[PDB]
Amino acid sequence: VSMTKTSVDCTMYICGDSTECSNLLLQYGSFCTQLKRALTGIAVEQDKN
Amino acid sequence: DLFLPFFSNVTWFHAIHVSGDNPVLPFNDGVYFASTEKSNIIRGWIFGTTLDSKTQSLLIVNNATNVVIKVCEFQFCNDPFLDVYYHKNNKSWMESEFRVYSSANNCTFEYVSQPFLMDLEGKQGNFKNLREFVFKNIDGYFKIYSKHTPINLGRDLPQGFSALEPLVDLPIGINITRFQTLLALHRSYLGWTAGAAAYYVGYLQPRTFLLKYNENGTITDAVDCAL
């Protein structure tokens, strides 16, 4: 009926709290927000199901 | 990395001096070497490309305490071995002459180190003990790993598990192609004195293994992925 909800800190997964990695990651724009949104979409659906 | 393949065909050598034949071994990729001999009759090794002073070569000699390692244009003898005997002028036991080589020419590297791999704590009544070594030569660096384990008298090289810890490392900076091992013959003056020396050799190969670390962080099992 459902599966485990998951949330990801995109920033912490890609960059291990490096600030210069985080400043490079901003060159890629909205992809981290798209991932977060998509996972939030999946997670909210498990309760709906 | 570079391992002894599982269930692989190892050579088992018996050597004996017989009181009143032993051609040089190849050394390709690296060597697993193992022995179970009592009374320290097996000591050390030669490794080299030519062994006759035309090019540099490696010598390792153990004795009753500490090791010497030397890298040199040695002219080795066709039978290199170590003698230790009672010298009456010193009233004690030591080596007479370095009958492993006819000459040592201009050597390039000289090294000395801790004894390693003694017999059991206070010895025991012929319950046995296996000593195991790995010798590897990569990027001009010569790496030594070893272990020993007590073994009950089923048979030597028993089924079970134990991994070799690294023990010594040295950048000999030379080609290796062949090798030999030094016996300690007892040579009791009243002349010579016979003794046997059993040892196993098994060359390693470039291989992938899956290693099972237990919660203590020791390799308690492995799979040879090409067996």
Partner: protein, 96 residues
């Protein structure tokens, strides 16, 4: 009819008490969501052509112009690892 039903419910308890894998359709969902996160955390070890996968090694050993071409490989590969995980989870979520 009651005795047949009462014995048929009895066989459900016996079947669920004896057999290992009858709930495989639910355990497979747990196993796939666990395998996917273990896979995603494995891809942190991957170098993607950088000198190390460990971000702190690069920042211990390089300076702020040649470090960046290492860090950018790791960003590129890790961002692809998340885009793969999230696509696989969006596809799984449609099956669920």
């Amino acid at each position: 009819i009651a005795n047949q039903f009462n014995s048929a419910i009895g066989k459900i308890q016996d079947s669920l008490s004896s057999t290992a894998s009858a709930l495989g359709k639910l355990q497979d969902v747990v196993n796939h969501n666990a395998q996917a996160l273990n896979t995603l955390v494995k891809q942190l070890s991957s170098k993607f052509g950088a000198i190390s996968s460990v971000l702190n090694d690069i920042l211990s050993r390089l300076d702020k112009v040649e470090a960046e071409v290492q860090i950018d490989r790791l960003i590129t590969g890790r961002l692809q690892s998340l885009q793969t995980y999230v696509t696989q989870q969006l596809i799984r979520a449609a099956e669920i």
